[PDB]
Amino acid sequence: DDLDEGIRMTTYDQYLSHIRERLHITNVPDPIYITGASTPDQIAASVQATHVAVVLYQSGVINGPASTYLRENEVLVVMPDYYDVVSRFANANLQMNNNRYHESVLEIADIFDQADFIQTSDAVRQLRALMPTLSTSQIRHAIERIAQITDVDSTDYGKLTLRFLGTLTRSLKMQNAQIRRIRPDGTVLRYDDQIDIEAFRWSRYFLDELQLRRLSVGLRLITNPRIARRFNGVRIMYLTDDDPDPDFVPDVPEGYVAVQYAHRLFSSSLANKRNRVTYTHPPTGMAYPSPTGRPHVHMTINERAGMSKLVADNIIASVIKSNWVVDILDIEYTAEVMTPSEGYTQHVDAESIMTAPKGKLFHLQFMDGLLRPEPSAFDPPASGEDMRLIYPLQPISVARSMRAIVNHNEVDRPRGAVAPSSYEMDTGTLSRNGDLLYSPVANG
Amino acid sequence: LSDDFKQISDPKGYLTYSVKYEDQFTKKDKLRASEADDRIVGPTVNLFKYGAAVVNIDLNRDFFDTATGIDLTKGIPLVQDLLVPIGVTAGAEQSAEYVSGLLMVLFKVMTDNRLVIVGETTTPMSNTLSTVVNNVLRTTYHNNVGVNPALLRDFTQVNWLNRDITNMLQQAGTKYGLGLTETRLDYVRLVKTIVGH
Amino acid sequence: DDVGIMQQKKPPTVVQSRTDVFNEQFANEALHPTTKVIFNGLDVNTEVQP
């Protein structure tokens, strides 16, 4: 089975936030619950009734014909929770497994056929995933800040200004909010075209149509890989500076052994009248007081936060003397790509990479040494060796359109030279409706 | 009238090419374009000049200005004091600034109410242009042509680049074009006729 | 492909000066490429041949 293939399913909270109000607004019966005695024909009648291909799950183990129907028709089951999901399905083949699934964003547009009530896409979810979880006051701070940037006097917004109670702030959070009539009890009523005006039907995130149209293009821009120039993680490996390409990531050598960093791996210990920072290899169990003579380790450091200066220094010393590879994942960095004539203006000692606060943004520099000209035949030999420690874990030249605009010889291309993508030049046409289009590839 | 838009000529984009040069490289031969072809192809040739070490595609700092709060001196948009800790000053060079940058970028795009009006435009006679340029040109074009690597064709003195760009431009699936074009909206009026460039 | 005539920019050149005995430490090691070299007097190729 392809990762795309299987039984689509989502948590009830997602259904409530995103699918349910839309169903309410389209005047269709609420989707049927699926007990263990649900025929595929019933699910079909439900799906054609709601025009949505969604069924809530109620209770019991679902029979296999229903499962094959749900799978063949890509129907989205809604679940109370993700505990013991396999227990909810009959397994004629026992192929289903709690660990065998593929989490992925599924745009509402792939479900609903009515474009009128769908303003965004997956891009907003991705952008939100970038955001730290915010307390309501942090949300208010964000909104007040954006208001400050756009020269709005946001004073008293979101606040009750009482004569005797003073000012009181209420939460500005109201994600997915809709305008709705309430019964005098205070409880919400479902939208009714008969009494409520059409404008209150769906709120469109309280944005102007044109603002939405533009918001779409902006979302495409924001999630473009070229703009995604904030990188996570740095491999630390003691190697000679051979490769011109900035985006070089040394491979871990064949003999190396992966080891997650943990405080427990390092200890004080006696060794030849010294209290050396012994390291114990998790496989062999062997203790190694000296940074020299340690087994080839590919150590991963997900979080530096508790690490002692002694241990960090010992890890670096192992990188250098025992030839460790240490992938530090906690690091986030911008990455300027220097050209050989401009050198490295900024420097990062190993200590600072190992001790910088989490959540601070490092600014690494990486030479593109492809434009270094050949040495003279009579330049004195270098007895020494230029070395390098820091490397990216991911491609860094994401913004790079072209490279090495010079001739090797007069006619040959320099190795690693980069032509502009054809797409940068395609300037096709306007669509029938005015959207930009690339030229047709094949004539048909 | 309500000022719903921001009429402007010669629009600036969200993305622009940035370029780093190694100045020690310089072709010995001096290419001699016609004055017209230099009027069109010039800003391109000048920017992707021989010796360009890298050519990046950055968000246009001129558009995502400090007035939006965005800083772009690094690889990424960065906006201070948007996503912050409460009860303490936010640390300098905090990573969350990147996310704020994206928000302010998204927002700034969401609110771009620019409405292009045609700027000054030349209409070269065909004979005044090299044929390769003339095939791309469509009668008129803005005097402020931006840059495009497609213009480098038969103009860059770098051989492999010319060969590669010529390949992509001779593919059926990609056709560079510049200047006034036959839009579906041609001859539609709105106090003034709409046209495509 | 051609030989550089202008003075090229070079990585910083730390001279390690190893002796019979020493205490190696790698705190504040540089991360950028660096030319560690062992001897102080490496300008040995003096006699230019016209």
Binding site: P340 | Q7, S9, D10, S18, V19, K20, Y21, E22, D23 | -
Partner: peptide, 26 residues
Amino acid sequence: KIATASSARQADVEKPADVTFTIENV
């Protein structure tokens, strides 16, 4: 002479639209 490096980036020119009083067509 020392080898050197230098950058460039395409300039903005997005002026507000000119207010002409001449007209092209009858």
